[PDB]
Amino acid sequence: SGFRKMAFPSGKVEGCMVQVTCGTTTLNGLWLDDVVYCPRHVICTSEDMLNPNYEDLLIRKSNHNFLVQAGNVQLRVIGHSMQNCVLKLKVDTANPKTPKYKFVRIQPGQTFSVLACYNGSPSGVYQCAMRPNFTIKGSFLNGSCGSVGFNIDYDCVSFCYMHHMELPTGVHAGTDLEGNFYGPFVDRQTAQAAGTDTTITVNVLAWLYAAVINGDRWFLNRFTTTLNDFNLVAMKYNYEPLTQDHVDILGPLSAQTGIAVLDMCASLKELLQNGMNGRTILGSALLEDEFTPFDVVRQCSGVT
Amino acid sequence: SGFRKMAFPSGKVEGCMVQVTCGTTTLNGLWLDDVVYCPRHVICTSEDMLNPNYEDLLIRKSNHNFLVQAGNVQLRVIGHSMQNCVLKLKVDTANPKTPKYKFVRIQPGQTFSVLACYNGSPSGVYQCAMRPNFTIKGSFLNGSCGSVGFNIDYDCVSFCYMHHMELPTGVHAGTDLEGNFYGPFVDRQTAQAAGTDTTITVNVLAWLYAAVINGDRWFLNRFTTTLNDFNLVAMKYNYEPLTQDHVDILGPLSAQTGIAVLDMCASLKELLQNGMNGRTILGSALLEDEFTPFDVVRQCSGVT
Numbered sequence: 001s002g003f004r005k006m007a008f009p010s011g012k013v014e015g016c017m018v019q020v021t022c023g024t025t026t027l028n029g030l031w032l033d034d035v036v037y038c039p040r041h042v043i044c045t046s047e048d049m050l051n052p053n054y055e056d057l058l059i060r061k062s063n064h065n066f067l068v069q070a071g072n073v074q075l076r077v078i079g080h081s082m083q084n085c086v087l088k089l090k091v092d093t094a095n096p097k098t099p100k101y102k103f104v105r106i107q108p109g110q111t112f113s114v115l116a117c118y119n120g121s122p123s124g125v126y127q128c129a130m131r132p133n134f135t136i137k138g139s140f141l142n143g144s145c146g147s148v149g150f151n152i153d154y155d156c157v158s159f160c161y162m163h164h165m166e167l168p169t170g171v172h173a174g175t176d177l178e179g180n181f182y183g184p185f186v187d188r189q190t191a192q193a194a195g196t197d198t199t200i201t202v203n204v205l206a207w208l209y210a211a212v213i214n215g216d217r218w219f220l221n222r223f224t225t226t227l228n229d230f231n232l233v234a235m236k237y238n239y240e241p242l243t244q245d246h247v248d249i250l251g252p253l254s255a256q257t258g259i260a261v262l263d264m265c266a267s268l269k270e271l272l273q274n275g276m277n278g279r280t281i282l283g284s285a286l287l288e289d290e291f292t293p294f295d296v297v298r299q300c301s302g303v304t
Numbered sequence: 305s306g307f308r309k310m311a312f313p314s315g316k317v318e319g320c321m322v323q324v325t326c327g328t329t330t331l332n333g334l335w336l337d338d339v340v341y342c343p344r345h346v347i348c349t350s351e352d353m354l355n356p357n358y359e360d361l362l363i364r365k366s367n368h369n370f371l372v373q374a375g376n377v378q379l380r381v382i383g384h385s386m387q388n389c390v391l392k393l394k395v396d397t398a399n400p401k402t403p404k405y406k407f408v409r410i411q412p413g414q415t416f417s418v419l420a421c422y423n424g425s426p427s428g429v430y431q432c433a434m435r436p437n438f439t440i441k442g443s444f445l446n447g448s449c450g451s452v453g454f455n456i457d458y459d460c461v462s463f464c465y466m467h468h469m470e471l472p473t474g475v476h477a478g479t480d481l482e483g484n485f486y487g488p489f490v491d492r493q494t495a496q497a498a499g500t501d502t503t504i505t506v507n508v509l510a511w512l513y514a515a516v517i518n519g520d521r522w523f524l525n526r527f528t529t530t531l532n533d534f535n536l537v538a539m540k541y542n543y544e545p546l547t548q549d550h551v552d553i554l555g556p557l558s559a560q561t562g563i564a565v566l567d568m569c570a571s572l573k574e575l576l577q578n579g580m581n582g583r584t585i586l587g588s589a590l591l592e593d594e595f596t597p598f599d600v601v602r603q604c605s606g607v608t
């Protein structure tokens with residue numbers, strides 16, 4: 001019992017964190033096999049960030065200008081290439097701690113763990129979600145770039161995010177491990193607005209199921225609704241539209257609690273329309289949307 | 305920018321997690337040097353838990369009845385002893401992954417990271433605090449016993465908690481690594497009520513400082529207060545009394561923001577008396593008390 005914003009164990013990802021320095025810029029890199037992945041803005045000065053031409057900036061860089069340090073030892077860079085917004089630095093040594101891994105591009109609403117790093121050293125681990133506007137509400141200071149987001153499936157690490165940027169609004173932007181930004185963000189110090197941060201409806205529902213499983217049942221009501229009626233209310237409250245796919249994905253939680261998905265939707269509808277009235281659900285005074293249905297099943301069943 | 309409930313990287317603690325089986329009971333153990341630490345209730349059956357006499361139950365156990373498994377390999381138990389509510393199993397092999405470590409007994413209000421484990425395998429990591437009633441609001445299923453709480457200071461892991469019990473109220477109870485329970489809890493399946501769960505005032509204040517640092521300033525007011533006046537209001541709201549030690553501990557956050565501690569106290573006082581009015585602070589609709597002043601300084605400065 002108890003429900004916590006839980007992150008995946010970070011050991012497997014800690015074994016991959018290295019420091020990459022180019023000129024005066026130092027950020028983090030991810031060392032998997034004989035390649036070190038890092039944000040391409042490592043080649044930029046703070047003046048370059050206003051309007052960088054990464055191809056031209058990269059021409060003035062050779063293998064020896066990229067200083068890669070793993071722990072306290074220097075890695076020899078035998079090649080370098082730019083793939084979208086990331087640099088791939090080929091080193092002569094394969095990482096002996098390379099876990100089984102995949103590079104995945106997640107969809108908005110999906111959650112992942114972030115290992116915040118500085119100078120190739122891990123400082124903390126937290127859980128977050130890819131917002132529907134393709135930003136992440138992270139915790140990153142200067143020097144955190146190159147910190148990664150990942151999920152673990154038993155022994156396979158699926159790397160889904162690499163930190164690149166903080167927007168003027170305090171939200172974060174980054175890429176998948178192929179260098180493609182999530183959302184319309186570009187690695188430039190220019191005016192970039194995030195877009196409407198809507199609530200991940202299916203995750204809120206999953207978290208309502210988690211509360212029922214853990215004993216918080218005050219919000220359960222005598223009502224039901226339809227997908228269309230619920231969506232009318234969801235639109236008004238800037239909630240993502242709920243589809244039949246979402247209902248299907250909530251099926252195992254619905255089965256475990258004996259509460260039909262549309263009944264939980266009517267409970268959520270009354271919570272949006274009437275508020276919490278000073279009450280809490282799983283020790284929270286707002287509706288939490290950063291647990292997917294898979295996270296709730298995982299946490300409530302103890303998958304290791 | 306951004307403020308997240310961040311846990312310490314868990315790699316160093318993952319390298320210590322083993323599975324301990326005695327009879328039909330399987331729980332987690334912590335392997336440091338040639339000793340495996342685990343809850344003594346590993347020797348109990350579910351019937352034994354009602355009224356166990358651990359000394360008598362232990363007499364019927366020999367070294368070979370404790371099955372210790374690290375990863376996929378079995379450790380040879382060459383000795384066993386009971387120290388308060390923990391068993392120490394001496395094994396013939398020192399853990400090659402033993403980090404630098406200490407065993408510490410924390411005070412209520414102090415925070416730590418938990419690596420929730422099942423069958424000696426880590427499943428997740430989260431941050432929590434030792435509540436003023438000596439319980440922890442964790443996330444633990446059956447089989448999680450022996451999961452540990454720790455803090456990391458650069459390379460030294462200070463182990464402060466070992467999970468033992470879940471109370472009928474869904475809160476958790478456990479010991480330090482010397483086997484002494486936090487609070488008045490005993491390792492028995494008997495009626496045990498936690499006590500008043502008060503709010504950790506100094507942590508709430510620290511988190512208000514974190515919000516100011518990260519831009520959430522709406523709650524800052526034109527008022528001030530005194531320690532005695534603030535404490536009158538704090539008592540009414542079941543908040544821990546604020547002492548001069550707490551004011552001193554908040555000094556570096558006070559210095560960074562230019563907001564005197566007593567001014568932040570008057571802001572908190574108005575928040576307790578008038579509520580949030582549908583507003584949020586650091587994306588939260590309630591006052592968060594599970595970040596110490598040290599955690600805020602650490603997160604906001606990037607200590608690795």
Ligand SMILES: O=C1N[C@]2(CCOc3ccc(Cl)cc32)C(=O)N1c1cncc2ccccc12
Nearest residue numbers: 041049140141142143164165166187188189305
């Ligand atoms: O290190 C960098 N360089 C920046 C500086 C601004 O101009 C740009 C523009 C584009 C890109 Cl890709 C990065 C950058 C950036 O946001 N970050 C930071 C990342 N995350 C958090 C930060 C917290 C404080 C300070 C800087 C942080």
Ligand SMILES: O=C1N[C@]2(CCOc3ccc(Cl)cc32)C(=O)N1c1cncc2ccccc12
Nearest residue numbers: 001345353444445446447468469470491492493
């Ligand atoms: O594994 C055990 N044995 C228990 C069973 C109850 O009687 C006692 C009495 C004292 C002690 Cl020390 C432990 C135990 C206990 O609480 N836990 C559990 C720990 N944490 C979470 C649990 C979630 C579900 C189920 C059991 C959980």
